Write a protein that binds this ligand. Structure first.
Ligand code: HEC
Ligand code: HEC
Ligand code: ZE7
Ligand code: ZE7
Lengths: 106, 106
C-alpha cells in the first residue's frame, strides 16, 4: 500500500461501496455492515451485524495491507461463490473430476 | 495433478457440472459450452458457443494442470464477478480507496 488520493477514493466508495456500506459513526447497516472504525479493529465484529461463516474461517486485524488484498476479490471470501460455477475446494476432488473428465470427454 | 478416481469424478460432474455442461460428442450447449474434446483444444473455442470476454483476456491450451487451477475458482474468470462485491482492478484504485476509507471511517 502507498498513500494515494483520498479525493479519488471518495468517489470510488460512493460508486462502488456505498450501495452496501455506510462509513460514518452510527451509520446504518445495509447488505454489508457499517464500516466506522474498521481499521482499528478485527474483521467480522461490527456491532449489530451478523456475518456469514467467513468470519469464523479467517480473521485479520484490518490494515492497509490486508484490506488491499481483500478488495482485490472480496467475492471469493463469500461462502458459495466458488462452488457456484463448479469450483472444487479439495485438491483430490479436482484430481478425481479431471480423471473422469479426460475419459468422458475424449 | 495426480491420477485419481474416475468413478468419484463422475459423481462430481453429475452433481457439480452437469447443470451447465454436457461432455458427450455432439452434446448440447447449456449455460456453459459442451466439453467434448476439451483436453485437445485451446480455451474459449467450442463450436456453436460464444463466450464472455474471458476468452480474449486469458488463453490456455487445456490440460490437467491448468484446469485444476481453473476449477479452484472458475467464477474468478467471469467478468463482473470481482466487481460485484466491491472488487478493485487497479492497485492505485485500491490505494486511493483505502486512503479515503482510513480518513472517512475515523
Ligand atoms: C467498495 C470498494 C467496498 C469496500 C471498501 C468494502 N465493501 Fe463490502 N461487504 C458486503 C457484505 C455482504 C459483507 C459481509 C461479508 C460476510 O459476512 O461474509 C462485507 C464486508 C466488508 C468488509 C469487512 C467488514 C468487517 O467488519 O470486517 C469490508 C472491509 C468491506 N466489506 C469493504 C457487501 C458489499 C457489497 C454488496 C453488494 C458491495 C458492493 C461491497 N461490499 C463493496 C465494498
Ligand atoms: C464442474 C466441476 C464444472 C466443470 C468441470 C467445468 N464447469 Fe463450467 N462454464 C460455465 C460458463 C458460463 C462457461 C463459459 C465462461 C465464459 O464464457 O467466460 C464455462 C466454461 C467452462 C470451461 C472452459 C470451456 C472452454 O471451451 O474453454 C471448462 C473447462 C468448464 N467450464 C468446466 C458455467 C458453469 C456452471 C453454471 C452455473 C457450472 C455449475 C459449471 N460451469 C461447472 C463446471
Ligand atoms: O487475506 C486477505 C482477506 C481476508 C478476509 C477476511 C474475512 C472477512 C470476514 C468478515 C467480513 C468478510 C471478509
Ligand atoms: O491461471 C488459471 C488458468 C485458467 C484460465 C481459464 C480461462 C477460460 C477461458 C474462457 C472460458 C472460461 C475461462
Amino acid at each position: 500500500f502507498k498513500a494515494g488520493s483520498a479525493k479519488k477514493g471518495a468517489t470510488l466508495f460512493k460508486t462502488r461501496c456505498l450501495q452496501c456500506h455506510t462509513v460514518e459513526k452510527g451509520g446504518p447497516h445495509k447488505v454489508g455492515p457499517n464500516l466506522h472504525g474498521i481499521f482499528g479493529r478485527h474483521s467480522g465484529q461490527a456491532e449489530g451485524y451478523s456475518y456469514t461463516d467467513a468470519n469464523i474461517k479467517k480473521n485479520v486485524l484490518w490494515d492497509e495491507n490486508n484490506m488491499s488484498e481483500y478488495l482485490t476479490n472480496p467475492a471469493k471470501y463469500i461462502p458459495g461463490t466458488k462452488m457456484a460455477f463448479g469450483g472444487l475446494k479439495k485438491e483430490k476432488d479436482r484430481n478425481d473430476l479431471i480423471t473422469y473428465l479426460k475419459k468422458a470427454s475424449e
